[PDB]
Ligand binder design. Structure first.
Ligand SMILES: [Mg+2]
Ligand SMILES: [Mg+2]
Ligand SMILES: [Mg+2]
Ligand SMILES: [Mg+2]
Ligand SMILES: [Mg+2]
Ligand SMILES: [Mg+2]
Ligand SMILES: [Mg+2]
Ligand SMILES: [Mg+2]
Ligand SMILES: [Mg+2]
Ligand SMILES: [Mg+2]
Ligand SMILES: [Mg+2]
Ligand SMILES: [Mg+2]
Ligand SMILES: [Mg+2]
Ligand SMILES: [Mg+2]
Ligand SMILES: [Mg+2]
Ligand SMILES: [Mg+2]
Ligand SMILES: [Mg+2]
Ligand SMILES: [Mg+2]
Lengths: 191, 203, 141, 244, 173, 107
RNA sequence: GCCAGAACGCGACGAUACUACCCGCACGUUGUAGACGUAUAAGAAUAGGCUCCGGCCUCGUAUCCUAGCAGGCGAUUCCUCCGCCGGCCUCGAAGUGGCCGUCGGUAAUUCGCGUAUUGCAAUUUAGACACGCGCGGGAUCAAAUCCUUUGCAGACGACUUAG
RNA sequence: GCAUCGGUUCUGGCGGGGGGAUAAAGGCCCAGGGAAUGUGGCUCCUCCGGGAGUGUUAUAGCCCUGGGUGUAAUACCCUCG
């Protein structure tokens, strides 16, 4: 069973410009520029109206049609990021040993670096370097927060997961030892 | 069909096993073949599938002495393509041995074989055979993870010859532009009746 | 909201679209059976372009730029002919590049040996005047 | 059936082909990785081995048992008369490896190096580099300066040809030893300029190495004629009552 | 295979006790009339107590499509044997004649269910007169209003004897 | 002046003998003619004459070149290959050599 | 990193007596997995490209070259195309191409003489790579092994040395 | 080597005859009855391409039954050259 016509649409607000060439999407707006390569998917791009982008697949199978909605939301994420940005929050969870962090500034390049000390009273100093375009801050709103912000959802989220995955307890019951750093909220910079 | 003195095949975009079957038939007929850019060939299926196939190949070796008789595992992209062709020729006879002498394989484009016309075999092109949505790999990448050492050297040299060819294109473009004006200028002025006589003949 | 899209655009398989069969024949689509087969016919006065009514597989057809407007779906042979002449399909196809290329080929397979010699001598006469003009432009540079 | 009690194998298969070395002089196979931000410098030397002796010094290793106490260690002494630079070589990168395309020599060669090119030097005519020397002082050495310009243009690594002065040792041999030493430096133009300025000049080992530096030694080990399995690999001897 | 529809009429041999026996008629799809008769005796042996040795064939004819140039939808009722047990289905096809649907059905069942010709019985074939009596969703999409679609990525045809082309082909036919 | 060539024949290649999968028959051969693809086009060359010329070592009657003569018998397969029969079977080392196809018995 | 180095895998350099080496053309005993117009250089995408910016693309079913005793001798005509040399530039993946100049040849048009007899078919002995030779010109004036010796080596050869 | 024949055999092209629902379809003409993936009109919405509703030939056409032109043409099967 092959479906003749499957179609989706993406609206575009009257603030930014988008251009597609050889299945390479470039989105540019007030807060910067992003690029994505979609040469691995057979999709037909078109201009439906004055401010609407259309995409469709012809004679596709059930498995092939599945990727059509995946592509639509990825491009929509790019539009959101260039006009509203993204913002993640993290919290410290400890029982006895306080956790100390040091978000030192740019290390002669655009990358930020985060140092974590005194995890469950260990002598390791463990270091993680963020992806370019991501800025890490120590919150002043209230205690024990790390705030990550940027333009692209993929880079901000993966870097946040890097911090969470590095603080792990080994050879212990993890239902009792809840030590670590966890993400708690996802949202945009504006509003 | 046609008989040339020698034919040069550009290897980029050709399936490994389908190109080797065409080549092995031509060699036994009497043709001479030269295959260029063996590092840009293709194999159908995901890359991980090809790696496992090669690892099973590497496990074979003569037990009592590994310096004799054992399957020698060549690691270069041209040598991988050569092994495929050698399995389709009776290489243990004088007739088969003579056929292999009509074949040359290289990585990149050596100086003798640039400044030449490179043919394409359409029964092995990937874009005309594989179903869209399937997965494929590159022979050049597979050689990297088995011990090929000169990947970056070939990449640098190929960038040089492609820069030289860009200047050659500009001269070729200018020549065609000048030839077009001559035909427009000459045909109007001189020939009174040769035009329509040629036109009725299909030229 | 500037949007620039550089993507391909094919020709649709609709009703009224005229195909070109392998042996130089034209047929107008009147009904779609599957994604692989259609029902088509072409009523043409010229016996070389005319084709009977029947089913044609889509893998032996080429899509020409001509499309007949407002052709009713599933029409009979009589109604198709009325629109075929009114739209002037025969005259429209004659001036396309595909038709000219086919005609330019046909004159070449029918050449007498004496006539092959004749075209070689005429080509040299035109070739002589080409090199004179080419050298003049090249010298000026 | 399986082996009764387990035990590791005798010997190592890494150094497996146990044949006599092809050449008497030790051969260097790799050089330190080049870095174009350091000043130009040589990376090897070569000398003759004298013997061993004993020293005494105090140790500085905090937390150890012998910290701040005298220790006794054995050392080795290497005779090292200065070397003389003779020429330089250039290499290029190819899809089959490295290869040398040019080489230039100095105008005058000592009788030590010329002995190396002959097997019966005493009854020869000693015409080793006679015709090559005329390339100097001929069109102001146009041929020589042509090759040097080529190396600055096409090469990626540069080596230097040097030899030892064996006449300054108590050795009976008069034939010198020759080798190539790679120059690791800022640029190819800098490498050749530094190398060319050292023609027929001596270089001392203190310019190459310096104190408390960690180095490597390459040579050919002491030989024994033809031995059985017991001493060659180190297997257990059979009982006293074994026949044959 | 390549089929065509027949009608075949049989009869029990008349006897002194029962002159003028009854007449039975069937519709059979078969490549030729030699196997058309053979299938008639096979189906009749499962309904009445008549054999070929004690029967005779009255008439065999060929039924041809009334309008072989009109597109129409068909529905087929059938039973078959699997590797364990027997089952009933109902499938649909879209084409111009009755004969081709049986040809299409035989190829379809052989692929999707591995059912051979030996183990398929055809119960009834009927042409769907209206458009709202179409059930299966792979035919509903073919009767949508103003149907039209392009044909992307179609390989050009090149002679199988012409090796060593001189330029890269294109797939924008 | 007169820069043209001198050719009045069609060139072909000697492929192999006539064989099954393990038995070969040197009586008849297979020849691939240049430019012929289908068996309809191969019908034009039925009955024509073909020649095989090669170099010897000794001179016999004013030349060092010998010839073996034959003619085309019937088509072979669907790809335009043809069968031929010579006065002597071909030397069996010429698998890949070239032969000349004339146009003597015309029309 | 480290160990061996294909004894039929490859590169740079030194000195080369005996014509073994280089240059010129002169023939030809002799060799070959097989000349007969052995004519054609962009890169990249294939759900997109090329361009002279006007347009063009299913198609190499294309383009270049192609007449004359196996291609003669003259004329009317025409500034095209091809070749051997020479000088400057350039080319390193297994080093190639360009520009200028002298000389020799040349149906784009139209003609005049010559062809027979190979007898009604019989390869149209014609290409470029090697190699053996013959002249007359140029440059050049070397090494290795045995033998005696050494012990950093060793069953004997071999290896490290000295004469 | 060619021409004229004999035996065996492979492979192209052309002219006829018969059969079936005396093919079925199909083109043009006559008579009757229907419907929708509803043409033109008419209503409403959208200016942003157009969409929705009503209703049986009009400024498009399609489906079903009977008859004429007919001993129509063609496909498939068989047969004389
Ligand atoms: Mg525990
Ligand atoms: Mg092993
Ligand atoms: Mg071996
Ligand atoms: Mg045991
Ligand atoms: Mg000893
Ligand atoms: Mg021991
Ligand atoms: Mg005993
Ligand atoms: Mg070796
Ligand atoms: Mg001699
Ligand atoms: Mg001149
Ligand atoms: Mg001489
Ligand atoms: Mg006969
Ligand atoms: Mg008839
Ligand atoms: Mg309406
Ligand atoms: Mg009727
Ligand atoms: Mg009638
Ligand atoms: Mg009738
Ligand atoms: Mg009739």
């Amino acid at each position: 069973m092959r479906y003749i016509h499957s179609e989706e649409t993406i609206p575009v607000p009257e603030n930014l410009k988008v251009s597609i060439k050889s299945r390479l999407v470039t989105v540019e707006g007030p807060r910067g520029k992003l690029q994505k390569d979609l040469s691995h998917i057979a999709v037909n791009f078109s201009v439906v109206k004055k401010g609407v982008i259309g995409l469709e697949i012809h004679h596709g199978s059930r498995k092939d049609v599945a990727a059509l909605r995946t592509v639509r939301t990825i491009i929509n994420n790019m539009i959101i990021g260039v006009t509203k940005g993204f913002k993640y929050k993290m919290r410290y969870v400890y029982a006895h040993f306080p956790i100390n962090v040091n978000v030192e500034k740019n290390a002669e390049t655009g990358c930020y670096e985060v140092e974590i000390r005194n995890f469950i009273g260990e002598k390791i100093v463990r270091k993680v370097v963020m992806a370019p375009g991501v800025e890490v801050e120590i919150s002043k709103a209230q205690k024990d927060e790390l705030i990550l912000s940027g333009n692209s959802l993929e880079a901000v989220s993966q870097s946040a997961a890097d911090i969470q995955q590095i603080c792990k307890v080994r050879n212990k019951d993890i239902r009792k030892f809840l030590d670590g750093i966890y993400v708690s909220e996802k949202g945009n910079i504006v509003e | 069909s046609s008989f040339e003195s020698v034919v040069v095949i550009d290897g980029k975009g050709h399936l490994l096993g389908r190109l080797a079957s065409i080549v092995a038939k031509q060699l036994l007929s009497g043709q001479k073949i030269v295959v260029v850019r063996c590092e840009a060939l293709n194999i159908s299926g995901e890359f991980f599938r090809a790696k496992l196939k090669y690892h099973a190949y590497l496990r074979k070796m003569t037990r009592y002495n590994p310096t004799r008789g054992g399957p020698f595992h060549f690691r270069a992209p041209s040598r991988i393509f050569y092994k495929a062709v050698r399995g389709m020729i009776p290489h243990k006879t004088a007739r088969g041995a003579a056929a292999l002498e009509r074949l040359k394989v290289f990585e990149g484009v050596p100086p003798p074989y640039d400044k030449k016309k490179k043919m394409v075999v359409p029964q092995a092109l990937r874009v005309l055979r594989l179903q869209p949505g399937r997965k494929y790999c590159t022979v050049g990448r597979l050689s990297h993870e088995v011990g090929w050492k000169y990947q970056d050297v070939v990449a640098r040299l190929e960038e040089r010859r492609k820069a030289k060819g860009a200047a050659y294109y500009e001269r070729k473009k200018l020549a065609a532009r000048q030839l077009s004006e001559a035909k427009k200028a000459a045909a109007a002025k001189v020939d009174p009746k040769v035009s329509e006589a040629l036109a009725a003949y299909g030229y | 909201a500037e949007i620039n899209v550089e993507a391909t655009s094919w020709r649709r398989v609709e009703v009224g679209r005229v195909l070109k069969l392998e042996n130089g024949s034209l047929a107008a689509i009147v009904e779609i059976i599957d994604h692989k087969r259609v029902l088509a016919d072409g009523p043409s006065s010229d016996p070389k372009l005319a084709t009977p009514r029947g089913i044609v597989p889509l893998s032996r057809a080429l899509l020409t730029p001509i499309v007949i407007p407002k052709l009713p779906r599933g029409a009979r042979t009589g109604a198709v002919k009325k629109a075929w002449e009114a739209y002037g399909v025969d005259a429209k196809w004659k001036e396309t590049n595909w038709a000219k290329k086919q005609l330019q080929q046909e004159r070449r397979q029918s050449l007498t040996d004496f006539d092959r010699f004749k075209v070689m001598r005429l080509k040299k006469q035109r070739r002589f005047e080409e090199r004179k003009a080419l050298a003049k432009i090249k010298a000026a540079a | 059936s399986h082996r009764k009690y387990e035990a590791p194998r005798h010997g190592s298969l890494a150094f497996l082909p146990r044949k006599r070395a092809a050449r008497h002089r030790g051969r260097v196979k790799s050089f330190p990785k080049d870095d174009p931000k350091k000043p130009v410098h040589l990376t090897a030397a070569m000398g003759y081995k004298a013997g061993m002796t004993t020293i005494v010094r105090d140790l500085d290793r905090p937390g150890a048992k012998a910290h701040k106490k005298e220790v006794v260690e054995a050392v080795t002494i290497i005779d090292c008369p200065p070397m003389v630079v003779v020429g330089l070589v250039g290499y290029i990168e190819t899809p089959r490896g490295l290869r040398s395309l040019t080489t230039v020599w100095a105008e005058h060669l000592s009788d030590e190096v010329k002995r190396r090119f002959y097997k019966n030097w005493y009854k020869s005519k000693k015409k080793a580099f006679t015709k090559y020397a005329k390339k100097y002082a001929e069109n102001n050495g146009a041929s020589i300066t042509r090759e040097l310009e080529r190396i600055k243009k096409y090469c990626t690594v540069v080596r230097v040809l040097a030899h030892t002065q064996i006449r300054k040792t108590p050795l009976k041999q008069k034939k010198a030893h020759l080798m190539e030493i790679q120059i690791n430096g800022g640029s190819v133009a800098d490498k050749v300029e530094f190398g060319r300025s050292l023609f027929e000049k001596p270089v001392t080992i203190d310019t190459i190495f310096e104190k408390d530096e960690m180095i490597d030694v390459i040579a050919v080990t002491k030989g024994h004629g033809f031995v059985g399995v017991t001493a060659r690999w180190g297997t257990k001897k059979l009982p006293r009552k074994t026949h044959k | 295979g390549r089929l065509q529809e027949y009608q075949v009429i049989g009869r029990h041999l008349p006897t002194e006790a029962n002159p003028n026996p009854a007449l039975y008629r069937m519709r059979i799809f078969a490549p030729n009339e030699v196997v058309a008769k053979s299938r008639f005796w096979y189906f009749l042996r499962g309904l009445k107590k008549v054999k070929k040795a004690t029967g005779e064939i009255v008439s065999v004819n060929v039924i041809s499509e009334k309008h072989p140039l009109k597109v129409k939808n068909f529905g087929i009722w059938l039973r078959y044997d699997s590797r364990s047990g027997t089952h009933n289905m109902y499938k649909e096809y879209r084409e111009t004649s009755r004969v081709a649907a049986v040809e299409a059905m035989y190829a379809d069942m052989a692929a999707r269910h591995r059912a051979r010709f030996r183990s398929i019985h055809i119960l009834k074939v009927v042409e769907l007169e209206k458009t709202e009596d179409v059930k299966r969703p792979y035919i509903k999409q073919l009767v949508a209003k103003n149907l039209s679609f392009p044909l992307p990525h179609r390989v050009p045809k090149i002679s199988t004897k012409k090796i060593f082309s001189a330029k890269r082909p294109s797939t924008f036919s | 002046p007169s820069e043209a060539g001198h050719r009045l024949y069609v060139k072909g290649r000697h492929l192999s003998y006539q064989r099954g999968r393990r038995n070969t028959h040197p009586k008849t051969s297979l020849i691939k003619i240049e430019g012929v693809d289908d068996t309809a086009a191969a019908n034009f060359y039925l009955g024509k004459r073909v020649a095989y010329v090669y170099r010897a070592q000794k001179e016999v009657r004013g030349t060092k070149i010998r010839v073996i003569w034959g003619k085309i018998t019937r088509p072979h397969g669907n790809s335009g290959v043809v069968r031929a029969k010579f006065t002597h079977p071909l030397p069996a080392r010429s698998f890949g050599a070239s032969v000349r196809i004339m146009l003597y018995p015309s029309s």
